[PDB]
Amino acid sequence: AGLLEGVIKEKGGVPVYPSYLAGEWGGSGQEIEVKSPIDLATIAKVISPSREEVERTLDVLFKRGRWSARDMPGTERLAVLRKAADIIERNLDVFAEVLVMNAGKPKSAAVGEVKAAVDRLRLAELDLKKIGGDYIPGDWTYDTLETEGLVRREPLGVVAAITPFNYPLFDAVNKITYSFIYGNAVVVKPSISDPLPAAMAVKALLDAGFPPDAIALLNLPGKEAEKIVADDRVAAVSFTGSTEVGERVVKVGGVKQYVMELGGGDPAIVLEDADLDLAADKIARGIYSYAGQRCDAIKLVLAERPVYGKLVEEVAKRLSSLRVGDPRDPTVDVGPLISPSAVDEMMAAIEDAVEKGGRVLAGGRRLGPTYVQPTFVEAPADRVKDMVLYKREVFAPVALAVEVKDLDQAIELANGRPYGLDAAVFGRDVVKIRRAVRLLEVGAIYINDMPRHGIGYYPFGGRKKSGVFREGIGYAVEAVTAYKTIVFNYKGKGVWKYE
Amino acid sequence: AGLLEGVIKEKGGVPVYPSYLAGEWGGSGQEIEVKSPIDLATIAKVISPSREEVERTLDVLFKRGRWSARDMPGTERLAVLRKAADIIERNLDVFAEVLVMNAGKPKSAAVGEVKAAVDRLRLAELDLKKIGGDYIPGDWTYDTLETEGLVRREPLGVVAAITPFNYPLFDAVNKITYSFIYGNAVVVKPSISDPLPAAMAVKALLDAGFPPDAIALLNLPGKEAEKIVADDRVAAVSFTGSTEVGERVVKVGGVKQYVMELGGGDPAIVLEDADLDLAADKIARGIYSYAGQRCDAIKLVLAERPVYGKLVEEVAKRLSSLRVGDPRDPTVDVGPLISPSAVDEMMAAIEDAVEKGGRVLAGGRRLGPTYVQPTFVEAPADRVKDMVLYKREVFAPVALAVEVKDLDQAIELANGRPYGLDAAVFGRDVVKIRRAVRLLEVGAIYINDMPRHGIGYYPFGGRKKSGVFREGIGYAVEAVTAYKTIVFNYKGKGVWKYE
Amino acid sequence: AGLLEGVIKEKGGVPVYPSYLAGEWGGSGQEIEVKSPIDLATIAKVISPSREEVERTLDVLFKRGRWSARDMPGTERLAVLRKAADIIERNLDVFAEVLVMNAGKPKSAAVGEVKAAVDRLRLAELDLKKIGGDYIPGDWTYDTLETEGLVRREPLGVVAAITPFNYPLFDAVNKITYSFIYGNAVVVKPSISDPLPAAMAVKALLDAGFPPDAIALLNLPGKEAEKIVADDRVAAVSFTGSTEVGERVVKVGGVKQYVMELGGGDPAIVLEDADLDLAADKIARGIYSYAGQRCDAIKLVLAERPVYGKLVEEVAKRLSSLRVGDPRDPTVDVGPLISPSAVDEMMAAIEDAVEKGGRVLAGGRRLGPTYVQPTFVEAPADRVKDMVLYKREVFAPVALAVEVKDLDQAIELANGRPYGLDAAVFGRDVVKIRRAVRLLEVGAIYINDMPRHGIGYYPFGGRKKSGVFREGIGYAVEAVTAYKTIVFNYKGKGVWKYE
Amino acid sequence: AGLLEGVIKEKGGVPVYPSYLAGEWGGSGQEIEVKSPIDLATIAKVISPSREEVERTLDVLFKRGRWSARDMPGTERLAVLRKAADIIERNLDVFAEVLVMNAGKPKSAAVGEVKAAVDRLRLAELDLKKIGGDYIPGDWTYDTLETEGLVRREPLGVVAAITPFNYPLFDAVNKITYSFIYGNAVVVKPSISDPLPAAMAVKALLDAGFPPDAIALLNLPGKEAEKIVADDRVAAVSFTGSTEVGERVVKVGGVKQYVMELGGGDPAIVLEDADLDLAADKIARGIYSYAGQRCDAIKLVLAERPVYGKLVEEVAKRLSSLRVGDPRDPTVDVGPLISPSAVDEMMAAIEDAVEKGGRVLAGGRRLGPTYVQPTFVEAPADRVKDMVLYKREVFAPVALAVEVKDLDQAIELANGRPYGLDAAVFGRDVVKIRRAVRLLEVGAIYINDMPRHGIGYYPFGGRKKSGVFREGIGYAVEAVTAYKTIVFNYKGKGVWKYE
Numbered sequence A, B, C, D: 001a002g003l004l005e006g007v008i009k010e011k012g013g014v015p016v017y018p019s020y021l022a023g024e025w026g027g028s029g030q031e032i033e034v035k036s037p038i039d040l041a042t043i044a045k046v047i048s049p050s051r052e053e054v055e056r057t058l059d060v061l062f063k064r065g066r067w068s069a070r071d072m073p074g075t076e077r078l079a080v081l082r083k084a085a086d087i088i089e090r091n092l093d094v095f096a097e098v099l100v101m102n103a104g105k106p107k108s109a110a111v112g113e114v115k116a117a118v119d120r121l122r123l124a125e126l127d128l129k130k131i132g133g134d135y136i137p138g139d140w141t142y143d144t145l146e147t148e149g150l151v152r153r154e155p156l157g158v159v160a161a162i163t164p165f166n167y168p169l170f171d172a173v174n175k176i177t178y179s180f181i182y183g184n185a186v187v188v189k190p191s192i193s194d195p196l197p198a199a200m201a202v203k204a205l206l207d208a209g210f211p212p213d214a215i216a217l218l219n220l221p222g223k224e225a226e227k228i229v230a231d232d233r234v235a236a237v238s239f240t241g242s243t244e245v246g247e248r249v250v251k252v253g254g255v256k257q258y259v260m261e262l263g264g265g266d267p268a269i270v271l272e273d274a275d276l277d278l279a280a281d282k283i284a285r286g287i288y289s290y291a292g293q294r295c296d297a298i299k300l301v302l303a304e305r306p307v308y309g310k311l312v313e314e315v316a317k318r319l320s321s322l323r324v325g326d327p328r329d330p331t332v333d334v335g336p337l338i339s340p341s342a343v344d345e346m347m348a349a350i351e352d353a354v355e356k357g358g359r360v361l362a363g364g365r366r367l368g369p370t371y372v373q374p375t376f377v378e379a380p381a382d383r384v385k386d387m388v389l390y391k392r393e394v395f396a397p398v399a400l401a402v403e404v405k406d407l408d409q410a411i412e413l414a415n416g417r418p419y420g421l422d423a424a425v426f427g428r429d430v431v432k433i434r435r436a437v438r439l440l441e442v443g444a445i446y447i448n449d450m451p452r453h454g455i456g457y458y459p460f461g462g463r464k465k466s467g468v469f470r471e472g473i474g475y476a477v478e479a480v481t482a483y484k485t486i487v488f489n490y491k492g493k494g495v496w497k498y499e
Ligand SMILES: NC(=O)c1ccc[n+]([C@@H]2O[C@H](COP(=O)([O-])OP(=O)(O)OC[C@H]3O[C@@H](n4cnc5c(N)ncnc54)[C@H](OP(=O)(O)O)[C@@H]3O)[C@@H](O)[C@H]2O)c1
Pocket: C162, C163, C164, C165, C166, C167, C189, C190, C191, C192, C193, C220, C221, C222, C223, C224, C225, C226, C229, C240, C241, C242, C243, C245, C246, C248, C249, C260, C261, C262, C263, C264, C265, C294, C295, C296, C393, C395, C421, C461, C462, C466, C467
């Protein structure tokens, strides 16, 4: 259809999306159904590549792709990304519709993601703020006298971009952009759950001029991807997903450069001097956006005694006034969760909190196989730590509320989860804020706002179980680039006169 | 003895070195013999820690060490490292003697390593050139308007420093220095082959004021160390060693920050316009230094036809005039190899080259279980690629010599090995040099000098099978530090007026 | 006409260009004739502002302009510059025609300048590579313990951009771009000799959305501009012009931030191993481009004995084959010099060289009041230093040729002029090149190419009499921005625990 | 005496200090008396150089000094500065005594300045955080394809360091250190008022190994120094002093690189949520330290209505409890002002404030020709702006106190003075603090502390009448260094393949 006109194959009434094998769209592997969480119906099929096609694709990426990407000057790479942005932008409605149907994303959120993808592509020139190399004079040590160094970055070669289901379009475009801008070839491996947006993005890139042998899109399910990760032709792996899969990926990959964005949720702290209107609004939104299916979703709210009552009151009201059900209605605030399993886990998690002294302050009602109300569970500090909702990341619209004596207890409870992605702090006192900033063990802290990675204007990434390394405009250069040092020796050659 | 007076325990006529358990020297595990390659005799014993002591040590490092190191202000950390430098310097002869006896290192090389360790410690202030964070204004995007970012570095926590046998003193001091200067606690795991120098360095650091609960020295053999690497309290692993072990380390460690310096040898290219006197001298030295037991040792020499004859002639003469045997004589140029196995492998490798058309131009004679002559094997370009000396790193004083038609063939053969640590290029033409620099796939290129990492004044590290990431003054901050982003939200707060 | 439709006033058959007074185009001062060097005819008139209008303009720029520019977020400033680029691009022929007629620039050179202006505007996002601030931790000194610093850039306010005649369009657009991208208001003061292109550029910027009260274009002759420079509301002065005027500007301005690009010519050195075809081509072009009316024009050629003959032979041939006369013909290689005076000076300078032992190798013939042939004058090393062509910058297509014994003499003669803008070195030996690079006292050295600032992709600027500070993408931030340091004190506040 | 044993010449009972003429201590110019503000007695004499000696000194600095400094490798420069630190440190009491006697500085302050000088010297290695150059790849523009750039810093040559009377030791050592660490020669021109400490510092540097022909110390009074500033061999001028003299210096110097630290006082703002104990303490100290003879002294206190009463009450008490009189007593809090004139001006300024509605809250009594009590004058917001104490910098221990309605009025009044050096803000609310930070027009803002430049750990400098450019560890590289760009051309040379 338009963008994917000659690519998609209507077979048996259901559109069949092929993989892109670094040159031609195709695939001879098993076909796999792709369903919508809105009605559990099959909306398309994707053709996975065969072992032989995976092998051939990697061979093309390694032997030719690395050079096609590297030998396309930066000035053209930029033109490619900008053109791709234009193509995605003019196909906005189509990109959004697929996000709504395939991911169950509310219309406004789907439109927001497409626009993030477009902006990420257009701002590729900002990534150059970290591209320059270093010139190191040698006269600061006797052994390096009359010597000199140049340190420059080089692309690693083939980057494997593995993406999650919750940001099927942005994550693929983001990783492709930063991997490509520095001269790398890329193998994209999207969630087999909602791989359609990536296929659409890759086509837009190909139409825009992206070297055809420098990119690949493989519709491989879970462990079928290990094959790519473990291959020596893959110099780097950019992975966004769960802690457990991330661990498996590194153990399969071995020595390579990695960026591991492993999520988990985020805690939000509200100090007694906080603007409770701003806090309640931002916290409610951080809890329910995209039905809590956000790595930076708020999963725990900690509020100092003097504001805990009002704060939790306001958040409860806001969550209760939300409208759930089918995401197409520009009226719905919350669509479905990606699978009935995800809802099952949320319900069980809520029961666990209740059995351990927790009390539901809002929501709690399952509305269908993939529908549930955003839930806010109050818990006493002395018991919250043993609750599943605390110890784990329940990927759903659910957060715990805990009253705390002071900042130290807030910080202590916030750091008590095994994760350390982001944290939020609402308050105004510079000293308490500076203290929280120093002691919260997370990759990023949001002062007076809900955690939101956006397009990575500010770098983000994990600590503890949330992973290692960062993504962000400019900063991602560290994950897909290697340094090259050139040491020039002029010892006794008369350039310098003892210096 | 002096430095290790109350630490070393003379038991059964052989000095017994205990492990340092983040607080007290001790150990209840198996005792292990430490031998000299000079005479295969046992010169000491080291006490390995028990599982329980490993567990307790990690617990101390994690619960207290991270904070002792982090809460010691940088100004004191620097004083600690400087004081340690003074202590090692005044104990120079003792440090050197142990290197000579334990590692079989020629006196001058042993003295050189101690001085490198001392300088590395004293120049810790230079590591600060990469410590500052970034302030990111938010008005360059509409979504971040009235927003602002601060990105600063933080220590990761506990860094596991795993070191090889060939630089038993420097590698431990280097990793400790860059890990500690940024606020990390450190677990050192030296080669069980020559762990004595590390014990001496750690004691000097402790005497200098290094927080006692922030450092540990565990004498664990090979796979006993996996226990440390795989532990969640270990946030980073700095490993210098072989490709194969490095792979195992990552597969055991899983997600963490890694610096993998995996060696392999280096190729040296000589262009027709090169100063052949300089080239022959530097290349000969790169081949035999420390009996080729250097990750940056020259293992392949490629010379353009018009200079190949003279060049190879000169290098052969130089290697032949070398004096082998016991390293104590300030007369000996080459001491023994670390083990009889290493020599066996070298001899077999030489036979392989010969059976495949290779011709010995210098050396070739084994002089004892751990002694051999520096060898230079000529090989025709059409057969060298299948030789063990080419396909593998034979850790010994042996290199291949190959005549080539031109630069492209030189580059092609240089890149043909599975490694990519450093490469050397001797010549004067800027264009040919720039071309080689762009196309040699290695972490570092040395123009008109043999490859020499020194103390890391210039960053170095691998490509391909030689690993990932870099070590160097300043640059090592990337391996033992994590970024922390703080996003401040002032939306609608009146700080800015639409900007 | 189109772009300047309602701005230009046809009065007495000659188009009258008004000044832009930070809000409205106008002027009540003396009217001044603008002539073409192609035929000495009056092609337009410009209205200079009255003292009162200068005062009022500065008042608007200071009281409102600083804030209009600063309060327009960077994201919009960028959109403004990009839109201006589009407007200039679609009006390319018109912009070029005026450059050809007003500056006497050959068509291709005029087209080249317009395109440079367009690209400079479009690449404003690259200027951000130097916009970020610094975060300075305080624990590296005892006195700053529990303290912390943030260093960010801020616009200075009102930047006075004073431009020369030889790049009437680019220089104005360049200075405006880097001054505006960081948040400054700008007063442009173009050469009263060819102020038309600036008027056209400013209009394009205004049409593009440039805050109307944040920019001004004042058609003031020479010393009438001192009034602007000396004013306290002008925080910076970006000046490109002659050494003598630059000196006067600083002496009138007093304490302020300055960028002084004071030209002078450039020497070119040819080593014995140089590609003489490349060298002859580039050197000939550096001598005659835009009739030598380029600050980076080659004014002295120094060649080692073994190549001097051929080199100078080839350059002479190339200069002789040039076609002079009226710049409209896409056939002409060289148009006229800006004024008959400039030609007079060139002729006198040639006579001086001849009277002192110099010999004309090419050109020498004046072809009219403003026309002359590109001239190449040979001179013996022992007499060249006293020649006007050496001691001074003769802004015309004329260069000296001097044979030298070796590199040291080349370097010595190159450094003998009172200028130090750029220098060129053709050769291949890295050591000789590195030596020349270290010893040539100039802001920039071009290896194997003629000196060419282009759009400042690489920073450039002077040494010695050629001025101070640099212009260039990114680097110009230093001239139009000031640092702001914020020191936070948390002494004894419990953020840190002794560190 | 010891340090200056063979240098000082006891003549007529009064020690005579000669100038240092870049090689030998001497001087044939007029002798000038140096007096103590403690008793107006002559304590020494300094020999000014003759015109001929000034000329010869500059000739030595230019022809040999530039090279002696530049050709001494950085590693030795550092050793020189460190050794000088040791020499000054062991002569601490002697250095302090002279500061007490010559500058009238209280013992503790004199000891503090010597220690700042010592630390500044020892931390010269931190200045290297800004010494590295940039490597600029050329493929981000079509015109620069197959091209490449290197941008490195170079010393300017001869830096003229002109210093004020209030920090006679530190300012000279600071400027010398940052000028020398990057490879420059230096001419020091101290205040003829208290030039003794500089003579002592220069000797310590010479004894430490500072190249003898690379430094000069000229005891020239006021306008006699213009001769140095105006000379073409002086590539940069680092000046710390009054606005008026700074202006004269630039007008005499013309085009050169300048750092102008022109002082003026600083305003301090106290928000309603401020810790008034901390604020009162820090503000009182900022008002009286060294008898207000500090460029960063607090001259205006602005406090929000709800805390104004207490705050001003507390500061008054603190100022009243101070002990004035002869600085030798480790008991005295405040010594004398540098001259009776300075006190006259302060008294007249106080009368002016009183005649305009001001009321003295503390002090006001002159105690002798050079002694006065620290004074705090209350003034109504509607009249303060016309007071001399507001409009001018009265270099003495005197500040105005003004009650304000809110932050906007505080900011408005703070920005109302013609200066913009530093400002202080005491309070805790992040939003109000961020607002003040954005709107205060000064080089530096101190949050919750009095303004204190210290040794420049954090860069500082002026805005408005307070000057241009910054000094600070690292940042001063901009004032005494110039960039050198090297552009390499590989167009069509086969390094890149279209990229
Ligand atoms: N260093 C570089 O990068 C660079 C680049 C391009 C050109 N240049 C140099 O500039 C010169 C060619 O340009 P040009 O002939 O037009 O030189 P110029 O006369 O020095 O240009 C001076 C600019 O300053 C104005 N001006 C003149 N007197 C002034 C005064 N007293 N106060 C304030 N402003 C004053 C001029 O306006 P009026 O036109 O009204 O006199 C003109 O706009 C050559 O020496 C060339 O090498 C240097």
